[PDB]
Design a protein around this ligand. Structure first.
Ligand code: ILE
Length: 234
């Protein structure tokens, strides 16, 4: 009976994957624009009084945990202000290196925030004034915000996985920054497969992967994992 509507279930799961990727792409896109705008505006006049005033504005401080500018001399400005660890250097941080490596904006993987000590991600971009970089701007979003975004939509759940197979954001915090192989050792889903049927705790799940279109610099996927019996029962 299943083998007759199995192509049907594929169609629903692909649809659910697409919708989820679309939403995330949309939620991130406005935040990417604010950081880009901040960087465009800094490049206007990169005097440090100006920078501070821009990063203090409510549109940025209500949207990000903090935003900041770092330069090639090692200096930085962060708003809201925070006590940084001794010897903190913005140049070595994943937002800075990421932004300098790309011709456009970028998004980090999860990393440990120097300010709060919590796992976050960052949107970052180089502020270019007339072709020349003047530093890197970024904004921090917490993993909990990202987890909350994903879990909005009883078959299953969504998670965010990079195109290298590293889980970035998953409702089970234990699996954050684990590869697929490490998180699903017994029976590993493969991105190369439209659908991967895997056993988790003696139950079959169906896992697909949907690319998130329209992100700058990164190729990430939405993963969907659904209980096979619940999915078919539907
Ligand atoms: C000023 C940079 C901030 C603190 C960034 N979240 C970092 O951890 O590097």
């Amino acid at each position: 009976q299943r083998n007759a509507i199995r192509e049907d279930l594929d169609n629903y799961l692909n649809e659910m994957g697409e919708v989820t990727a679309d939403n995330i792409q949309t939620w991130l896109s406005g935040r990417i624009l604010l950081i880009e705008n901040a960087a465009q505006n800094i490049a206007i006049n990169p005097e440090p009084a100006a920078v501070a005033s821009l990063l203090e504005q409510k549109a940025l401080t209500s949207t990000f945990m903090a935003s900041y500018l770092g330069d090639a001399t090692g200096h930085f400005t962060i708003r809201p202000d925070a006590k940084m660890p001794d010897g903190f250097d913005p140049r070595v941080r994943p937002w800075y290196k990421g932004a300098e490596s790309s011709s456009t904006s970028t998004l980090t993987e999860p990393y440990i925030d120097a300010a709060t000590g919590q796992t976050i991600i960052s949107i970052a971009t180089a502020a270019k004034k007339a072709g020349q970089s003047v530093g890197v701007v970024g904004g921090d979003l917490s993993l909990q915000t990202l987890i909350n975004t994903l879990s909005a939509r009883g078959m299953g759940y969504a998670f965010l996985v990079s195109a290298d197979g590293k889980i970035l954001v998953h409702p089970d915090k234990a699996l954050v920054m684990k590869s697929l192989k490490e998180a699903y050792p017994q029976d590993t889903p493969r991105i190369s497969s439209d659908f991967s049927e895997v056993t988790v705790d003696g139950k079959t799940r169906i896992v697909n992967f949907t690319p998130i279109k329209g992100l700058p610099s990164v190729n990430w996927y939405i993963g969907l994992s659904v209980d096979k019996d619940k999915a078919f029962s539907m």
